[PDB]
Design an enzyme around this catalytic site. Sequence first.
Site, PDB file in Angstrom:
ATOM      1  N   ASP A 280       9.770   0.949   2.168  1.00  0.00           N
ATOM      2  CA  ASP A 280       8.706   0.729   2.102  1.00  0.00           C
ATOM      3  C   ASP A 280       7.926  -0.207   3.208  1.00  0.00           C
ATOM      4  O   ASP A 280       8.034  -1.500   3.184  1.00  0.00           O
ATOM      5  CB  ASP A 280       8.028   0.563   0.741  1.00  0.00           C
ATOM      6  CG  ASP A 280       6.543   0.569   0.706  1.00  0.00           C
ATOM      7  OD1 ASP A 280       5.943  -0.866   1.305  1.00  0.00           O
ATOM      8  OD2 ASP A 280       5.889   1.553   0.096  1.00  0.00           O
TER       9      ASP A 280
ATOM     10  N   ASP B 276       4.343   5.818   4.481  1.00  0.00           N
ATOM     11  CA  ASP B 276       4.794   4.447   4.443  1.00  0.00           C
ATOM     12  C   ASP B 276       5.904   4.265   3.922  1.00  0.00           C
ATOM     13  O   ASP B 276       6.696   3.513   3.970  1.00  0.00           O
ATOM     14  CB  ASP B 276       3.770   3.936   3.431  1.00  0.00           C
ATOM     15  CG  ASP B 276       4.275   2.473   3.211  1.00  0.00           C
ATOM     16  OD1 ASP B 276       4.051   1.318   3.667  1.00  0.00           O
ATOM     17  OD2 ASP B 276       4.616   2.029   2.116  1.00  0.00           O
ATOM     18  N   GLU B 277       6.453   5.651   3.282  1.00  0.00           N
ATOM     19  CA  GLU B 277       7.751   5.322   2.464  1.00  0.00           C
ATOM     20  C   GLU B 277       8.516   6.461   2.350  1.00  0.00           C
ATOM     21  O   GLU B 277       8.557   7.730   2.578  1.00  0.00           O
ATOM     22  CB  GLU B 277       7.487   5.019   0.962  1.00  0.00           C
ATOM     23  CG  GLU B 277       6.100   5.398   0.466  1.00  0.00           C
ATOM     24  CD  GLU B 277       6.088   5.031  -1.057  1.00  0.00           C
ATOM     25  OE1 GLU B 277       7.055   5.527  -1.588  1.00  0.00           O
ATOM     26  OE2 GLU B 277       5.242   4.062  -1.230  1.00  0.00           O
TER      27      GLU B 277
HETATM   28  N1  LIG Z   1      -4.932   2.940  -2.994  1.00  0.00           N
HETATM   29  C1  LIG Z   1      -4.367   3.073  -1.779  1.00  0.00           C
HETATM   30  C2  LIG Z   1      -2.984   2.413  -1.765  1.00  0.00           C
HETATM   31  C3  LIG Z   1      -2.484   3.069  -0.081  1.00  0.00           C
HETATM   32  N2  LIG Z   1      -3.005   3.484   0.657  1.00  0.00           N
HETATM   33  C4  LIG Z   1      -2.366   3.932   1.875  1.00  0.00           C
HETATM   34  C5  LIG Z   1      -2.857   2.724   2.976  1.00  0.00           C
HETATM   35  C6  LIG Z   1      -1.504   2.012   2.791  1.00  0.00           C
HETATM   36  O1  LIG Z   1      -1.259   0.884   4.044  1.00  0.00           O
HETATM   37  C7  LIG Z   1      -0.357   2.774   2.815  1.00  0.00           C
HETATM   38  C8  LIG Z   1       0.765   2.433   2.122  1.00  0.00           C
HETATM   39  O2  LIG Z   1       0.406   2.254   0.496  1.00  0.00           O
HETATM   40  P1  LIG Z   1       1.312   0.944  -0.200  1.00  0.00           P
HETATM   41  O3  LIG Z   1       2.756   0.954   0.543  1.00  0.00           O
HETATM   42  O4  LIG Z   1       1.190   0.816  -1.374  1.00  0.00           O
HETATM   43  N3  LIG Z   1       0.940  -0.703   0.633  1.00  0.00           N
HETATM   44  P2  LIG Z   1       0.752  -1.386   1.706  1.00  0.00           P
HETATM   45  O5  LIG Z   1       1.831  -0.489   2.804  1.00  0.00           O
HETATM   46  O6  LIG Z   1      -0.365  -1.339   2.851  1.00  0.00           O
HETATM   47  O7  LIG Z   1       1.200  -2.728   1.726  1.00  0.00           O
HETATM   48  P3  LIG Z   1       2.631  -3.079   0.802  1.00  0.00           P
HETATM   49  O8  LIG Z   1       2.257  -3.702  -0.346  1.00  0.00           O
HETATM   50  O9  LIG Z   1       3.318  -1.966   1.082  1.00  0.00           O
HETATM   51  O10 LIG Z   1       3.537  -4.260   1.700  1.00  0.00           O
HETATM   52  O11 LIG Z   1      -1.037   3.920   2.100  1.00  0.00           O
HETATM   53  C9  LIG Z   1      -4.390   4.028   0.531  1.00  0.00           C
HETATM   54  O12 LIG Z   1      -5.050   4.622   1.304  1.00  0.00           O
HETATM   55  N4  LIG Z   1      -4.959   3.806  -0.594  1.00  0.00           N
HETATM   56 MG   LIG Z   2       4.298   2.774  -0.212  1.00  0.00          MG
HETATM   57 MG   LIG Z   3       3.866  -0.029   2.158  1.00  0.00          MG
END
Ligand SMILES: Nc1ccn([C@H]2C[C@H](O)[C@@H](COP(=O)(O)NP(=O)(O)OP(=O)(O)O)O2)c(=O)n1
Ligand SMILES: [Mg+2]
Ligand SMILES: [Mg+2]
Length: 347
Positions: free
Chosen positions: A9, A107-108
């Site tokens: 991730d 992201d994953e």
């Molecule tokens: N509610 C959300 C959750 C995530 N996303 C998008 C933007 C994020 O940067 C991406 C990845 O989600 P995520 O992996 O849960 N969080 P993010 O990578 O930003 O931070 P981490 O907590 O993974 O380090 O998906 C979104 O648009 N709406």
């Molecule tokens: Mg994620």
């Molecule tokens: Mg992430």
Amino acid sequence: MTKWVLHVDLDQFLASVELRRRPDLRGQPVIVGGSGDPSEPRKVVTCASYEAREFGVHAGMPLRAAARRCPDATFLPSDPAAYDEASEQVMGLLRDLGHPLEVWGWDEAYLGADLPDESDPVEVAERIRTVVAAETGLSCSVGISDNKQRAKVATGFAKPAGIYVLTEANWMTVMGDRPPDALWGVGPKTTKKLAAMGITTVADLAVTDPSVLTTAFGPSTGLWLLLLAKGGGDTEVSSEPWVPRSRSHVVTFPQDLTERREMDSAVRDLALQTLAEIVEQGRIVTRVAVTVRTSTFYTRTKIRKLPAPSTDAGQIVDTALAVLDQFELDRPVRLLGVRLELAMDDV
DNA sequence: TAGGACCC
DNA sequence: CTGGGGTCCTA
Ligand SMILES: Nc1ccn([C@H]2C[C@H](O)[C@@H](COP(=O)(O)NP(=O)(O)OP(=O)(O)O)O2)c(=O)n1
Ligand SMILES: [Mg+2]
Ligand SMILES: [Mg+2]
């Protein structure tokens, strides 16, 4: 041998991509989300940097709300094209390791690594973080287990910039006291319903009578909640590419719509945009769904099936507009959506 | 087909 | 005051 499932991730993904081309911003709360104007309502934070989360900003928070919590934040508009490109780069690296890799969104990813018992899966996780950080300058975290949902839980504990192994041996040690929504697949509603019947932890859930769960949640979900609590999950990593079942666009207007012609015209436009996009992907529509959300956040969806799968613009627009017309309207409209379901057969 | 839940 | 885009199961 053991079939490890590794969950990779990206750390604070959109903020990282920004920071990587903006060194003027390091050690500063950076928030990514909706034109980059924190005063605009009806727009949310999409990725807050770690520094910003320190102020309680999070994904899904309205921009106005984040500005109130973190007044010194730098707000940047979402650059999807930069993120697609940063993602594909990370995937290509992950796929190049030779393991089955199952990519989910930007992201994953799940990587499956069948390893002899003397081999440490932590070595592969360490390989992954090194290579990702050295070629892309992004940091990721790796959760390690023998199923997806359990690996996914491990990644939470690996955060940030680390690796965490969660197995049958420490699962209950680690999870037993946590509320049920610590489990991937269990959110606030299930947690609330569970607490009302007096199941308040993963350990409680893990020993609940099956009838209790299947009565309360259904014959499949009830057994699935119990499997989740016991630390089980999906275990096959497929490298097969995801074929979308549908495509959709929704819009939340700056001001609630009251004029029918405006409503007609948004649904027309979303139907057309989605259709152009599906055609480019070589797909064929089977069903057309319209969604209406009023000023009070009552959200209903209707759907009509085409008489034969089609790609024809006149027909799809006409169908979306007749579906709209089945809603009792006039009552102010916050959001309109069109979703097109797609033929699974052939392509 | 409608709805509700979850997740990124 | 509460985005946008998917997927799955239950009634
Ligand atoms: N509610 C959300 C959750 C995530 N996303 C998008 C933007 C994020 O940067 C991406 C990845 O989600 P995520 O992996 O849960 N969080 P993010 O990578 O930003 O931070 P981490 O907590 O993974 O380090 O998906 C979104 O648009 N709406
Ligand atoms: Mg994620
Ligand atoms: Mg992430």
